[PDB]
Amino acid sequence: IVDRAKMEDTLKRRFFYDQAFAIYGGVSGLYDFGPVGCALKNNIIQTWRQHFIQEEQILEIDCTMLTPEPVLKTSGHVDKFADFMVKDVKNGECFRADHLLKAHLQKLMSDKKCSVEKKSEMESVLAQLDNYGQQELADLFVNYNVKSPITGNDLSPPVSFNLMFKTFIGPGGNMPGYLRPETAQGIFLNFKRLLEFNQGKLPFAAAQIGNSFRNEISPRSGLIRVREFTMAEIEHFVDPSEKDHPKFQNVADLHLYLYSAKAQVSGQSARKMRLGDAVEQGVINNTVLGYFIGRIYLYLTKVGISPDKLRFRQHMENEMAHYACDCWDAESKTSYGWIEIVGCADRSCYDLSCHARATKVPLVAEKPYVEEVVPNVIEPSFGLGRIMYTVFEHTFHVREGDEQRTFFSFPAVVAPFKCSVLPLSQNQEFMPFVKELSEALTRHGVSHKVDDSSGSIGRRYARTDEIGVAFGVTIDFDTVNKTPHTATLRDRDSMRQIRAEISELPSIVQDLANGNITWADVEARYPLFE
Amino acid sequence: IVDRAKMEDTLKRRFFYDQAFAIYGGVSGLYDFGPVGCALKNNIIQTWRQHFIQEEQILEIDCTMLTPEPVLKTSGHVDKFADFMVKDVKNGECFRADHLLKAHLQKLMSDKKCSVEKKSEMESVLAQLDNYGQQELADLFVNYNVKSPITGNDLSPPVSFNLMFKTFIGPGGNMPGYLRPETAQGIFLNFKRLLEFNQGKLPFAAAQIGNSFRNEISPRSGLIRVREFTMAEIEHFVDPSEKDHPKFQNVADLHLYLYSAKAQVSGQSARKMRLGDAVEQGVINNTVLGYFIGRIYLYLTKVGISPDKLRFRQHMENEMAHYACDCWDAESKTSYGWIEIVGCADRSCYDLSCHARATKVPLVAEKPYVEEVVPNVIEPSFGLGRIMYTVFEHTFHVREGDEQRTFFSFPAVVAPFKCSVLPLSQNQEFMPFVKELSEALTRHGVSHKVDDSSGSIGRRYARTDEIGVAFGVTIDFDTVNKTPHTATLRDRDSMRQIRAEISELPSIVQDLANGNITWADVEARYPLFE
Numbered sequence A, B: 001i002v003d004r005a006k007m008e009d010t011l012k013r014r015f016f017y018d019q020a021f022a023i024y025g026g027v028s029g030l031y032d033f034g035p036v037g038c039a040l041k042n043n044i045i046q047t048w049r050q051h052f053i054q055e056e057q058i059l060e061i062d063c064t065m066l067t068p069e070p071v072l073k074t075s076g077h078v079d080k081f082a083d084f085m086v087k088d089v090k091n092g093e094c095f096r097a098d099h100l101l102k103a104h105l106q107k108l109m110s111d112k113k114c115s116v117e118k119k120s121e122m123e124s125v126l127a128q129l130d131n132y133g134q135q136e137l138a139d140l141f142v143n144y145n146v147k148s149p150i151t152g153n154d155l156s157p158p159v160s161f162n163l164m165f166k167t168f169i170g171p172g173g174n175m176p177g178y179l180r181p182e183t184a185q186g187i188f189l190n191f192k193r194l195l196e197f198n199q200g201k202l203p204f205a206a207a208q209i210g211n212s213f214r215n216e217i218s219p220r221s222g223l224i225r226v227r228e229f230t231m232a233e234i235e236h237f238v239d240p241s242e243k244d245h246p247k248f249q250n251v252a253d254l255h256l257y258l259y260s261a262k263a264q265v266s267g268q269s270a271r272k273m274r275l276g277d278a279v280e281q282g283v284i285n286n287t288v289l290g291y292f293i294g295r296i297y298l299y300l301t302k303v304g305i306s307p308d309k310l311r312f313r314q315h316m317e318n319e320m321a322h323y324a325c326d327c328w329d330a331e332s333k334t335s336y337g338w339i340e341i342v343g344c345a346d347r348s349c350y351d352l353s354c355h356a357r358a359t360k361v362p363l364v365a366e367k368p369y370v371e372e373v374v375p376n377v378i379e380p381s382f383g384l385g386r387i388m389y390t391v392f393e394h395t396f397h398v399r400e401g402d403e404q405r406t407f408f409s410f411p412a413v414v415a416p417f418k419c420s421v422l423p424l425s426q427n428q429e430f431m432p433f434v435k436e437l438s439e440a441l442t443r444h445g446v447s448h449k450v451d452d453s454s455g456s457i458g459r460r461y462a463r464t465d466e467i468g469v470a471f472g473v474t475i476d477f478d479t480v481n482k483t484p485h486t487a488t489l490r491d492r493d494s495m496r497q498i499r500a501e502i503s504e505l506p507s508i509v510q511d512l513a514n515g516n517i518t519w520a521d522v523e524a525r526y527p528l529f530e
């Protein structure tokens, strides 16, 4: 439960992000990231690089965004990559039928005049929205007589709208192209050279961290629905008969909420199972999928996503992506409800075969005399933007004070900068201490910034808390004149303080940020300071 | 003088980069970067972040690539951002008139039948190619009767071709847009919030590191001419009356080749002046421009660009970009001749005014009672791709041996990974040493990789040299069985070796890579090893 309004005001005021081309009216689905937004975004990307690429020794490549039409036609995007769209016969307003129908039912379930039986009927309908096809969705639009949310007009029947941006490569219109809606294709077209890196053996994973474009019909979810974003995609090529991951046992003991396809059709809630158990019973197909689901859980959690607002939902029969057979999405509970922030599909051998057949170029591998096989690929897809937004709503808090101050309980690994060093005076009296502390923090690899802003220490930290700085060190006169020279350490979340010699604080902060020590531990060793 | 052919073969074989969508015929102007290509590209970006953003405390932002037409129409790109194009009346082959005329004259100057007087005439023409306008270029195409390079056909008159990619944002064609040809605009539309970070005082700089698109007419220069690339742009906002940079004296003593507009019109060669002297005489307008020209020189140099193949060329009167008044480009001598890899324009107050007037939104600042002013901006534009390519041609070498091996003398700060650790056996006998060395190197922040490839040590390093690994440590039996336990250190460029205790090598390599010690110094302290 978060006050989106108040938050968007803080994120825009401190400039995490904001409307792109604001002075022109702004384009929906487009936003720019300010200084703190980039710092946070970079921390999230770097953390991701460590968690996956570095942890699994994934091969990295950087493919182009521009894509010639033939490529996307083969992958099947030109035909299936789209959302159903509607528009009132009056003017040309377009809406994503998928979501309009959802906002309409929620409207009816909110009206007190709604009976219990109908409320239930509608709930069952929403829990199957991603299944309904061209026709099924057309009927519901009639049964509920759905009409334009603005000055209720009559909506035309739901039709498919390809989400890919169109363009022309080079002069003339002989080579029409698109902006890649995902990165996966780039890795597939370079399968041979990539497979070659691993001696030609399976399994192995390739990844990409770049921009993708989706000409979203009607973006109205802030950063949740942009037409341009950064995504990290991992393509894990494995033997279709060796779909077993050697490291699964590393996450087999995690307890996370799973919402299987069955539980969705049988109308029951999601369960909090143990990964290992989930695979045993058959809920989660194999262990390769199970490993990544665990690593994903760990990543999102480490970055700041709340376990109580995180779950993995499996796709339904006809919800499947045109390229997948099985899939699980990491959805986060937000002010916009449950939304996927990480897609993890098991798109068998769809891709490699399509390109192989179309280009007349074989894309396979061998196994022991020797047999050739088309690697099944599990694709963990990360929408960094959505992941960051979720972090905002899950760590945004209002201080218990009339002044209505706000702060983000950002984990030390993602916060703009771990420590904030703020002295009272700037005279050559404090510099000797500020300089030393700063450099000391630098030797400990602790990002920091010397606060100069005007106002009382309390007001100084107020700004620090707004952008989620994890810790702060106050350097007052008792630090310069008294001896031993001690400074004040402040915990962002609790606002509680500590007093210790300014030469020891560096290592203390380091351990606090690296999770080697608890704020509790700190209060146990050093004297409290109010 | 480099054998482009042989090089492109090594860059593509080891997978630094290669044709994008290769299995489809490949699209010109598009390439993908493989593992080593990304490692190198990332090192170049990181080095750039340290050199500029971190060194000048530049504010970073990340704007969108999609841009609504009105924005680019105001900036003047919709009208002036283009290259002159020609095409043979026969088929529809398009060519950049600018470059075709250049390739034609070079052809005539190469034929022995060419007289000295005409050769001179043509040289004077090429040294003014970027000045010739719509008409002047049309006449030359007649005087020299330029015809299609392929099966000589008759070329149509030179016409302007807007280099911007076209697209439509959202459903329908009511909001036509483009892909940003540069990033600068993004910073300008966010001038108010950016100026706000600096208390509203000048000067201050904002920067962006992202992708830009240029629908290049006929790309045929490898990575030199792509339709999609990564660029780092710095927008340095300064008081039009305070165009003086406080740090200029930090680079005032650099000797670099300058090729002023005069020297280009007066038909004389470029001079190797001292930055300070250059500003004195008035060659380089102010010191703000002089500082950046120095920092740029230092950056390119540190990354691997050869000083003897680097120069800064000033634009001519009508060569000016539609948004600039003065400018200097860092051009590198390559197999494609001199090409700009860094643009440094002094586009006064063109931008801020244009957007202010069009949006009816003021974009100014104040100065001491107080006067408002439109900040003059100096834009150092970096084409990371071109900078990396230049590094390739300037560090690519062929070993003096029949086998024709190749290697890149990459500076330690940009090489894929600084040290290569390669043992003879993998048995539990060597592991204790390999493990220790590896971790030790990690504690010293020295990137490395344990070589496993088969073949003799000499053949092992052959692969290491190909991707430019700076150093190598050989761990043989005399390392495991003998005592003290010593290993062999190998310099990539010289291939000369050294023998020292395996516990001291970590710090030795660190200093060698961080430029704290010379390979000469090493051979002076430790015993040589053949």
Ligand SMILES: Nc1ncnc2c1ncn2[C@@H]1O[C@@H](COP(=O)(O)OP(=O)(O)OP(=O)(O)OP(=O)(O)OC[C@@H]2O[C@@H](n3cnc4c(N)ncnc43)[C@H](O)[C@H]2O)[C@H](O)[C@H]1O
Binding pocket: A080, A082, A083, A130, A131, A132, A133, A163, A214, A216, A223, A224, A225, A226, A227, A229, A231, A318, A319, A320, A321, A322, A340, A341, A342, A343, A381, A382, A383, A384, A385, A386, A387
């Ligand atoms: N019968 C049917 N036929 C065809 N389609 C059917 C269908 N039934 C249901 N559908 C669904 O309709 C499509 C709607 O797509 P979208 O328009 O992208 O809406 P979405 O469901 O919120 O994102 P999506 O699910 O596509 O993200 P993805 O896995 O591609 O990639 C991974 C995601 O990328 C990121 N991401 C996606 N869109 C983003 C955006 N606009 N902004 C920021 N991040 C985004 C997310 O963080 C990450 O989870 C779904 O792809 C498809 O499953």
Ligand SMILES: Nc1ncnc2c1ncn2[C@@H]1O[C@@H](COP(=O)(O)OP(=O)(O)OP(=O)(O)OP(=O)(O)OC[C@@H]2O[C@@H](n3cnc4c(N)ncnc43)[C@H](O)[C@H]2O)[C@H](O)[C@H]1O
Binding pocket: B080, B082, B083, B130, B131, B132, B133, B163, B214, B216, B223, B224, B225, B226, B227, B229, B231, B318, B319, B320, B321, B322, B340, B341, B342, B343, B381, B382, B383, B384, B385, B386, B387
């Ligand atoms: N009268 C006139 N009217 C209009 N135009 C006239 C003119 N007389 C001459 N011209 C010239 O014609 C245009 C041709 O442009 P381009 O088509 O980009 O060719 P260029 O000169 O090699 O690059 P450019 O000079 O544009 O790079 P820029 O400063 O924008 O940005 C910085 C560069 O970005 C990078 N970069 C640019 N293009 C790249 C590419 N295709 N691939 C990779 N990197 C690229 C480079 O590394 C970096 O130096 C020049 O912009 C303009 O000066």
